[PDB]
């Protein structure tokens, strides 16, 4: 269907996971249903859901951005945007002279069509490592290429099934090249880290017409980009 993208301009850049932790710390004392909505927690406990999370943080040059997938995620972002903006306004009016928080909002539709020619898509800061078995797959390129193939195809199928639209099942993807390999730490000052890929390029015969999220740690702000900017790039 359609997804929603809300940008919060603050005047200074804060990272997606840091903004996630900041709105977790700030709105915690009051309104527990709303933070249970935005961090996609279980209705009874603090543990997040194992399914596809509808609302995820993203990257903004002057602040942070929020993505609500589908009608439910769009409604959650719609009921949560003024409370988040008021919390940011009070937090940054408590200290200093005080800044003005600007907003932006977009409703990007989702579409996909199969074409008989390959198409190029570059994904920045995608997490692909979670276990030791994937590390054993990563050492050899032949058994790692098929792993990236299946990961990209399953991420596309999971997002298409989560948003509620049908995807053709004859898609042939291919993975060409990589630029860098780095690490991602969920919590600062922790020994544990997950391997991640920087500037991967992929080739799929079909075309995409919106924000598409691939890989792991999608909620934290990893492995997503707009295909609308990348088709006809400029």
């Amino acid at each position: 269907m359609f997804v929603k993208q809300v940008f919060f301009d603050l005047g200074a850049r804060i990272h997606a996971d840091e903004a996630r932790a900041l709105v977790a710390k700030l709105l915690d004392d009051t309104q527990p249903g709303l933070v249970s909505a935005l961090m996609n927690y279980m209705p009874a406990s603090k543990t997040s859901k194992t399914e596809f999370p509808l609302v995820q943080f993203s990257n903004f040059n002057q602040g942070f951005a929020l993505l609500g997938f589908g009608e439910v995620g769009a409604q959650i972002l719609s009921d949560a945007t003024p409370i988040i903006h008021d919390a940011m306004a009070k937090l940054f009016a408590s200290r200093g002279q005080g800044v003005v928080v600007q907003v932006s909002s977009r409703d990007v539709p989702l579409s996909c069509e199969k074409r008989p020619y390959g198409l190029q898509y570059t994904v920045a800061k995608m997490v692909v490592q979670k276990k030791h078995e994937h590390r054993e797959r990563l050492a050899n390129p032949e058994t790692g290429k098929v792993f990236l193939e299946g990961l990209f195809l399953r991420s596309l199928e999971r997002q298409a099934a989560a948003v509620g639209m049908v995807l053709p099942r004859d898609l042939v993807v291919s993975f060409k090249g990589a630029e860098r390999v780095s690490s991602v730490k969920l919590r600062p000052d922790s020994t544990l880290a997950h391997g991640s890929l920087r500037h991967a390029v992929f080739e799929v015969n079909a075309r995409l017409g919106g924000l598409w999220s691939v890989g792991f740690l999608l909620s934290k702000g990893f492995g997503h980009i707009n295909t609308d900017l990348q088709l006809g790039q400029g």
């Binding site: 005047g11 719609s78 009921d79 003024p82 306004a89 009016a93 003005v100 600007q102």
Partner: protein
């Protein structure tokens, strides 16, 4: 040409808190307005709309016809005095966009050209008649023209 005009939301382009110190309250009032705009956008008219308006392209030549039903020469002189300083006014237009500006390339008085760059040349008896009629022009005729029985 369809000419496109858009209205920007002013406080969507602040940038700094030095621009908001004249707004009473400061950042809090602009943030409340932003919250109201957000509540409008999720669901009362807003601002910064995008619109278009078809206009006639400039630089083309027009024609105007002003006919008279057996006029006195003071009336013809009145119309020519309007045509002399017609260039200060605007034809219809959007006042903000400075539309309707025009020069008069000519005035034909029953077929003969009486217009030059320095206003109207010729038709002297109409000008003397309207100069005679402007003198002695009292309010009394206007009063018993507008007076309703």
């Amino acid at each position: 040409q369809v000419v496109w005009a858009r209205r920007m939301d002013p406080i969507l382009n602040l940038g700094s808190s030095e621009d908001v110190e004249v707004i009473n309250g400061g950042a809090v009032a602009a943030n409340g307005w932003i919250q109201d705009l957000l509540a409008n956008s999720k669901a009362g008219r807003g601002l910064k709309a995008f619109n278009a308006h078809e206009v006639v392209i400039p630089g083309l030549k027009w024609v105007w016809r002003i006919s008279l039903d057996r006029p006195t020469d003071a009336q013809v002189g009145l119309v020519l005095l309007a045509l002399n300083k017609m260039t200060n006014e605007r034809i219809a237009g959007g006042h903000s966009k400075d539309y309707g500006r025009f020069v008069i390339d000519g005035v034909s008085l029953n077929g003969e050209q009486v217009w030059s760059q320095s206003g109207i040349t010729g038709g002297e008896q109409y000008f003397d008649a309207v100069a005679e009629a402007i003198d002695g022009l009292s309010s009394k005729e206007f009063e018993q023209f507008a007076q309703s029985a």
